[PDB]
Amino acid sequence: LPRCDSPFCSLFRIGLCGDKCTCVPLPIFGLCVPDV
């Protein structure tokens, strides 16, 4: 499977992890986690 491994992400820009992974903003910025 393709990987995102996006180094950062934020609640303003969740598009760092689009379609494939999801980021958790805490508080404003967050890390990106691939479920798959």
Side-chain angles (χ1 to χ4, degrees):
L1 294 173
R3 312 308 301 146
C4 315
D5 284 278
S6 313
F8 58 91
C9 190
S10 302
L11 54 73
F12 298 114
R13 284 302 195 172
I14 58 178
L16 284 299
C17 313
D19 177 81
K20 308 189 187 308
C21 309
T22 307
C23 65
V24 53
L26 68 173
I28 302 301
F29 63 91
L31 58 78
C32 190
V33 63
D35 186 60
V36 296

